[PDB]
Tab-separated table of C-alpha atoms and ligand atoms in Angstrom:
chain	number	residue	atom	x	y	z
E	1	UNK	CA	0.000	0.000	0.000
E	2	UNK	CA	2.997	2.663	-0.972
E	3	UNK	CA	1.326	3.453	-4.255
E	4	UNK	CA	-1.298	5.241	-2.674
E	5	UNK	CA	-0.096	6.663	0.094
E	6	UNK	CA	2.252	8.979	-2.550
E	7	UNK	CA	-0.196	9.425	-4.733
E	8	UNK	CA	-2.981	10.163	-2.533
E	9	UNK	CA	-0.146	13.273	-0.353
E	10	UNK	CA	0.088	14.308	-4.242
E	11	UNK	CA	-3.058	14.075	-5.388
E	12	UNK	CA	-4.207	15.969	-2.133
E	13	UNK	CA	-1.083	18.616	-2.325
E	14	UNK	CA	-2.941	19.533	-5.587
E	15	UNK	CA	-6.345	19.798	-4.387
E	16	UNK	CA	-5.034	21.651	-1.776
E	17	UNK	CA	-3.033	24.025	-4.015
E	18	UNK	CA	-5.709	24.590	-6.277
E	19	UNK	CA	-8.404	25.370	-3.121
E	20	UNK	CA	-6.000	28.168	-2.162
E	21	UNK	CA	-5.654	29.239	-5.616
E	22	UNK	CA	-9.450	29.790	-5.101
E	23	UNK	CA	-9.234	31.747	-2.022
E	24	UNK	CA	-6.837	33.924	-4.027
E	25	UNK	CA	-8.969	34.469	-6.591
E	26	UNK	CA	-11.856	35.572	-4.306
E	27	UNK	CA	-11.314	38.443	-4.190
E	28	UNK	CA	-11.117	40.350	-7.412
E	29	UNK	CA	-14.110	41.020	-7.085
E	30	UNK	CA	-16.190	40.721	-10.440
E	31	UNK	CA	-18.766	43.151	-9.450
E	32	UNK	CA	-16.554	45.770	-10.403
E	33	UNK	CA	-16.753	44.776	-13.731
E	34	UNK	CA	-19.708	47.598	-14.007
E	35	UNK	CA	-17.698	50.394	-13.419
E	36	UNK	CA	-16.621	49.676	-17.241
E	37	UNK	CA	-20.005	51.000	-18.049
E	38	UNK	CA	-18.834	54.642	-16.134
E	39	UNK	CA	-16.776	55.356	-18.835
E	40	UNK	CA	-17.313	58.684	-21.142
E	41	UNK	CA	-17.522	56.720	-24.234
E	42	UNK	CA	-19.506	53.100	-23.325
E	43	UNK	CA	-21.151	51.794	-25.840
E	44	UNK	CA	-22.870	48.068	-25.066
E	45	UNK	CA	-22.332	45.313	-27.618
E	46	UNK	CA	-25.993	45.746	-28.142
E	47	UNK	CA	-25.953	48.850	-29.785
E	48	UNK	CA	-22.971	48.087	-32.272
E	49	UNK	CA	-23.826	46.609	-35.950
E	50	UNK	CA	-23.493	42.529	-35.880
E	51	UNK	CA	-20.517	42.884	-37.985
E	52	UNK	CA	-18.708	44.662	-35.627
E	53	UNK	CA	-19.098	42.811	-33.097
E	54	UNK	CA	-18.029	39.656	-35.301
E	55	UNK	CA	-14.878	40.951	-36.442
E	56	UNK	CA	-13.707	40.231	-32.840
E	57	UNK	CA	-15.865	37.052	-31.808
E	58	UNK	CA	-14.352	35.324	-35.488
E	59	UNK	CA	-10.900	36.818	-34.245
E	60	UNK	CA	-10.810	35.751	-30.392
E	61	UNK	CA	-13.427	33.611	-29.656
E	62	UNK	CA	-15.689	32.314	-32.434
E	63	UNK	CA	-18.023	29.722	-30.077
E	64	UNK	CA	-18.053	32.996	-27.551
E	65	UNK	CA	-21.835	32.758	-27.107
E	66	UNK	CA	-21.186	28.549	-26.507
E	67	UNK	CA	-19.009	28.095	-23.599
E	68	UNK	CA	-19.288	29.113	-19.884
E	69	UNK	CA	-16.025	31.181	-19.858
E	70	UNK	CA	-13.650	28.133	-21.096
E	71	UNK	CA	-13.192	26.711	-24.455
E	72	UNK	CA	-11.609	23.194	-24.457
E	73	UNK	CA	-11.064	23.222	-28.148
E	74	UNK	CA	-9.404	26.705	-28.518
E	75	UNK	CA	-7.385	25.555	-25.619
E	76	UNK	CA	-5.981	22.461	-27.140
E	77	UNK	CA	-4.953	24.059	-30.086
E	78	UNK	CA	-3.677	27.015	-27.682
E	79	UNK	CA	-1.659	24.403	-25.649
E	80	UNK	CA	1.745	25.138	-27.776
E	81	UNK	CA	-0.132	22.824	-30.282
E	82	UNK	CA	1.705	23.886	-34.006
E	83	UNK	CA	-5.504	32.686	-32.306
E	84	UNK	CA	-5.596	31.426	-28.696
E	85	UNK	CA	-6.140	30.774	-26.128
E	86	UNK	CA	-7.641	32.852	-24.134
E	87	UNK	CA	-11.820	33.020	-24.487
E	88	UNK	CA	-13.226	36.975	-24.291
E	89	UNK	CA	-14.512	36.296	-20.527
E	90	UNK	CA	-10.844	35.678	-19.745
E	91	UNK	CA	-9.086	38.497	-21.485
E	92	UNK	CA	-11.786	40.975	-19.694
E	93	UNK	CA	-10.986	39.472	-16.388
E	94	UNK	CA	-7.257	39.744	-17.265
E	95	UNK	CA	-7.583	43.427	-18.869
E	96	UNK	CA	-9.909	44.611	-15.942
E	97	UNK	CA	-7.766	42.891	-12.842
E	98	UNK	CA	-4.709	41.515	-13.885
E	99	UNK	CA	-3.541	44.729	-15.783
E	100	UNK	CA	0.135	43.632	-14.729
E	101	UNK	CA	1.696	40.430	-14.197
E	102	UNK	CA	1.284	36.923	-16.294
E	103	UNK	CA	2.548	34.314	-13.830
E	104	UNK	CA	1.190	30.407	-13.175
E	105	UNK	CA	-1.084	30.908	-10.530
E	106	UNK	CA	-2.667	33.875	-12.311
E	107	UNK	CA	-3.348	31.858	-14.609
E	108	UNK	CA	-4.963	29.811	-12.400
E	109	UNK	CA	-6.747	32.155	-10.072
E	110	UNK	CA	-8.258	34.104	-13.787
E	111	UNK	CA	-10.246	31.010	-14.397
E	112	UNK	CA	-11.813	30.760	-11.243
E	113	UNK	CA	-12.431	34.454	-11.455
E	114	UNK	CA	-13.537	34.395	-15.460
E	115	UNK	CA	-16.180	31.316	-14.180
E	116	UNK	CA	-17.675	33.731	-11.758
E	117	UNK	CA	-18.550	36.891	-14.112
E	118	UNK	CA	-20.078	34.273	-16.777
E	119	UNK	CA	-21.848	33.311	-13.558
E	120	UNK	CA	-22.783	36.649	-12.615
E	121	UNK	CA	-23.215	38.225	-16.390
E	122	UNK	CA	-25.082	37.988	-19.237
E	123	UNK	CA	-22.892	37.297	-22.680
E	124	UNK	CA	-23.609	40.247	-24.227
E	125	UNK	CA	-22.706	42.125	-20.947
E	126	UNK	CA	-19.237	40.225	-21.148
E	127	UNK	CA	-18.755	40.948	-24.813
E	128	UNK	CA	-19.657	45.399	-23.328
E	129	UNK	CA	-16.930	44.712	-21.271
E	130	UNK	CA	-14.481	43.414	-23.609
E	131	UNK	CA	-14.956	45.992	-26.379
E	132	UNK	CA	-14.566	48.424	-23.869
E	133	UNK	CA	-11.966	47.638	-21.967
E	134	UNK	CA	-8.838	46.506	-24.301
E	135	UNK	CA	-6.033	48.289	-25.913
E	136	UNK	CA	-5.980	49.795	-29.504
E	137	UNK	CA	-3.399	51.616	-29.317
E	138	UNK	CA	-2.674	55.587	-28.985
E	139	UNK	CA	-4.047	55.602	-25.393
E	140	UNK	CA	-7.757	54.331	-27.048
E	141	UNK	CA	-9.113	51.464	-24.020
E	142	UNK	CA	-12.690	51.873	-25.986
E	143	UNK	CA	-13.717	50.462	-29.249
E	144	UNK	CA	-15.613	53.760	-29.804
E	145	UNK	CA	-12.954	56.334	-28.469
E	146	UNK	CA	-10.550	54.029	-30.913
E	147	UNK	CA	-13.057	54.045	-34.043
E	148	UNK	CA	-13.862	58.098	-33.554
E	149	UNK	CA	-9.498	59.004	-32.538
E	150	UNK	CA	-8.484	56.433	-35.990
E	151	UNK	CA	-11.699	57.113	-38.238
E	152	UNK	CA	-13.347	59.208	-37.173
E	153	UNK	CA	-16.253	56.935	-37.045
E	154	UNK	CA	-19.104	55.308	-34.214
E	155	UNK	CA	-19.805	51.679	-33.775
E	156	UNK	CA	-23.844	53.285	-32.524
E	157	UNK	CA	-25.853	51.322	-35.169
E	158	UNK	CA	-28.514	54.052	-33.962
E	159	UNK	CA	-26.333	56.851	-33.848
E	160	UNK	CA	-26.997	59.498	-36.726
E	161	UNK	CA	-24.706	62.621	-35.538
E	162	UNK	CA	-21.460	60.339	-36.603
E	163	UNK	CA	-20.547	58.163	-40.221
E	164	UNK	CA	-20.931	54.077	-39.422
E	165	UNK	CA	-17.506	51.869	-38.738
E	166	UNK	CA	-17.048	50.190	-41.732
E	167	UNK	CA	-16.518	46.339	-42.057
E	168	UNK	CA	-12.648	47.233	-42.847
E	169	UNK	CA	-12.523	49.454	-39.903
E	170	UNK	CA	-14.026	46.799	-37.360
E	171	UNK	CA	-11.892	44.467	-38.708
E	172	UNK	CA	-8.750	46.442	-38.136
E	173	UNK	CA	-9.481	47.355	-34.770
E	174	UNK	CA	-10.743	43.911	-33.962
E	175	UNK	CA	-7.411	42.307	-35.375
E	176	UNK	CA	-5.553	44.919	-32.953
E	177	UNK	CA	-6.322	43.721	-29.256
E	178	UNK	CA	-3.510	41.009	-29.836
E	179	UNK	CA	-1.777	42.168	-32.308
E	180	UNK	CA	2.174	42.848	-31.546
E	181	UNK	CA	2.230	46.351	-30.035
E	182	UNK	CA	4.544	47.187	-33.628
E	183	UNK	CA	0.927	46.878	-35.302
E	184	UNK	CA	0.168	50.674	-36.107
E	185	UNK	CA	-3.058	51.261	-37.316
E	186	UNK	CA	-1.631	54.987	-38.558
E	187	UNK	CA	0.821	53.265	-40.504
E	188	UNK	CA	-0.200	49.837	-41.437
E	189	UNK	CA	2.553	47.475	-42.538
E	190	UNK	CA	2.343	44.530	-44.493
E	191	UNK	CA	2.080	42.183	-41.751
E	192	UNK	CA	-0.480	43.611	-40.277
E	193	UNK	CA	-2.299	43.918	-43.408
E	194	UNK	CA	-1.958	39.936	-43.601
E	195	UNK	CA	-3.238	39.859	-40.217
E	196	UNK	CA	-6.872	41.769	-40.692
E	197	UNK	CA	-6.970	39.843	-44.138
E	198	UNK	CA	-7.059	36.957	-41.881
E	199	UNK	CA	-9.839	38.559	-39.645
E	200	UNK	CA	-11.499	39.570	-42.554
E	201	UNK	CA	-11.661	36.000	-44.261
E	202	UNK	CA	-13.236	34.918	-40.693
E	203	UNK	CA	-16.061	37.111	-40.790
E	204	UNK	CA	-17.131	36.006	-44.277
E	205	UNK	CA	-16.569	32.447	-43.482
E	206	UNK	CA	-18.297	32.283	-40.166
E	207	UNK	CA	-20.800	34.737	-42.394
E	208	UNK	CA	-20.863	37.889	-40.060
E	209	UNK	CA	-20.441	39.405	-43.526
E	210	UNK	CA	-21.390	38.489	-47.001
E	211	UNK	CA	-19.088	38.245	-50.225
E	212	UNK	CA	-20.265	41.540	-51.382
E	213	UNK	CA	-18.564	43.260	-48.108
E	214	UNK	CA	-15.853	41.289	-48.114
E	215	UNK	CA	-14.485	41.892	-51.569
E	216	UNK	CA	-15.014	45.321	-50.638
E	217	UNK	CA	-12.932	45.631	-47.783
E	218	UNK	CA	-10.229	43.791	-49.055
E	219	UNK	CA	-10.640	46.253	-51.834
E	220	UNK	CA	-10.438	49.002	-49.372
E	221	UNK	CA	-7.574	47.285	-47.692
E	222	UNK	CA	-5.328	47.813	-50.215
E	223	UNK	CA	-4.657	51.084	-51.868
V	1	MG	MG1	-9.675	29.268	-23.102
């Protein structure tokens, strides 16, 4: 009876490691996830075009709507497998808390956390917090403050006082959030190009646009 005496003190060591891990987690509390909605420029998913909000679910998390805050699939492929890995409840729990470090147990401790604001939110909620809470560069943390400081353009389907964010557009901005910092929207190289090609090719295949807008935007894309 060795066997399972060691494995048992391991399997237990875990258990116990990953109940603290909890406790660590708690709190960061998720709650404050509404203070997002305080800022100047909000703008819920819910009011934004599909399209826009599909040039960043076909970018970072195409089964968004499907899971409870973890993707198994995405995180296979993610596991240094030859887009991932990270599902949009964890990058807002990251952006919002986490705004500094990227260790192990942070790891850990932002999936207990990113399982409690699925529990606690809505998805379209989650998806208001993500597009309003990342980085697009030039000191923009809101997809509208970025589409208005870059375009000059809204992402309000109902506004009226301001032109509409293209499909290019979205798909630039959307293909920024992970993009390497180099990425420069002002001053697109060809890289980066590639990349919202990429996005771009996602939207019409997971049909958040149509051929027609497509072809257009890759038109637009390059001159
Ligand atoms: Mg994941």
């Amino acid at each position: 009876r060795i066997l399972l005496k060691i494995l048992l003190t391991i399997l237990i060591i875990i258990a116990l490691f990953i109940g603290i891990m909890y406790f660590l987690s708690t709190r960061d509390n998720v709650d404050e996830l509404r203070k997002i909605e305080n800022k100047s420029s909000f703008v819920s998913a819910d009011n934004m075009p599909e399209y826009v909000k599909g040039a960043f679910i076909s970018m970072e998390d195409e089964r968004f709507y499907n899971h409870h805050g973890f993707d198994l699939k995405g995180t296979t492929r993610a596991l240094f497998s030859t887009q991932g890995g990270s599902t949009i409840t964890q990058q807002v729990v990251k952006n919002y808390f986490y705004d500094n470090d990227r260790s192990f147990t942070r790891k850990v401790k932002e999936l207990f956390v990113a399982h409690r604001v699925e529990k606690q939110y809505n998805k379209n909620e989650i998806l208001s917090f993500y597009l309003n809470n990342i980085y697009f560069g030039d000191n923009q943390y809101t997809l509208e403050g970025a589409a208005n400081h870059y375009f000059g353009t809204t992402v309000n389907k109902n506004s009226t006082t301001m032109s509409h964010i293209t499909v290019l557009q979205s798909a630039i901005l959307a293909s920024k959030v992970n993009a390497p910092s180099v990425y420069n929207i002002n001053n697109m190289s060809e890289n980066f190009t590639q990349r919202v090609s990429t996005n771009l090719e996602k939207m019409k295949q997971q049909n958040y646009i149509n051929e027609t807008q497509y072809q257009q935007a890759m038109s637009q894309l390059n001159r």
